[PDB]
Design a protein around this ligand. Structure first.
Ligand code: YE6
Ligand code: MN
Ligand code: NA
Length: 261
């Protein structure tokens, strides 16, 4: 049973969402060749705790060891920050942030292109973000999640890319992952009609190559089976009366915070 949020709770979601977004805005300057994913994590955690007076929702979740997930190139998600893993020219990197503030969660992520961008890493990130934007434009009461998943997949595959099946968007509030599940592809199992007040995430994972993925033996790191590049972008939203409001919008986003139909 999916739950609706109250006006007060939604305001708290705006705050946690903004904080999540601001972590990504803060870290951007440090995302350069030579930096380790470990340092970036410590920077993010220090900021979340000492500046935002919030806490990382990832730290300890199901035993997660770090504060943010950092995934590079062929790594699909849940990449673990490490003091020896350095970023280099050409790399595409996702920093996945989740913060809890005043009891509510804010969840978002984006891609960063390191050094000189390559046409393909550049193209994969742009298409991935557009697939998120396209889905965000469909959000309004009355529409079924299945349609949104359908549209993301059709857009993505038309570009020669593939949509990761194992992971999905999700309801969010006082809990990290609440109902419903938000698939980024068409599924006969999906039947959820949006309603005002619902809060969830949209976070498509797109592979340049095949959809198949393999988990590493650290029990967390997920890579593409064919070792092709993978990209992801995420935003937390609240369904409004005639559309939705992006709670994790950043200065660099090129979509309106409030989407009115
Ligand atoms: N958008 N990112 C997420 O929803 C997310 C980040 C980390 C996790 C996670 C999922 C299952 C178990 C442990 C973690 Cl930290 O989910
Ligand atoms: Mn999420
Ligand atoms: Na990746």
């Amino acid at each position: 049973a999916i739950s609706i949020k109250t006006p007060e709770d939604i305001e708290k979601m705006r705050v946690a969402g903004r904080l999540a977004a601001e972590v990504l805005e803060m870290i951007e300057p440090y995302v350069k060749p030579g930096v380790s994913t470990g340092e970036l994590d410590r920077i993010c955690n220090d900021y979340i705790v000492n500046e935002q007076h919030a806490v990382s929702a990832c730290l300890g979740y199901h035993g997660y060891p770090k504060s943010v997930c950092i995934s590079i190139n062929e790594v699909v998600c849940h990449g673990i920050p490490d003091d020896a893993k350095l970023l280099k020219d050409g790399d595409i990197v996702n920093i996945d942030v989740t913060v809890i503030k005043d009891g509510f969660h804010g969840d978002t992520s984006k891609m960063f292109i390191v050094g000189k961008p390559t046409i393909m890493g550049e193209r994969l990130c742009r298409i991935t973000q557009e697939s998120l934007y396209l889905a965000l434009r469909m959000v309004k009461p009355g529409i079924n999640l299945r349609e949104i998943g359908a549209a993301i997949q059709k857009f993505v595959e038309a570009e020669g890319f593939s949509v990761v099946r194992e992971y999905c968007g999700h309801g969010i509030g006082r809990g990290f992952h609440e109902e419903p599940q938000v698939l980024h592809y068409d599924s006969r199992e999906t039947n959820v009609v949006l309603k005002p007040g619902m809060t969830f995430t949209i976070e498509p994972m797109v592979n340049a190559g095949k959809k198949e993925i393999r988990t590493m033996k650290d029990g967390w790191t997920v890579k593409t089976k064919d070792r092709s590049l993978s990209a992801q972008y995420e935003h937390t939203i609240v369904v409004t009366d005639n559309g939705c409001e992006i709670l994790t919008l950043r200065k660099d986003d090129t979509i309106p915070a409030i989407i009115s139909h």
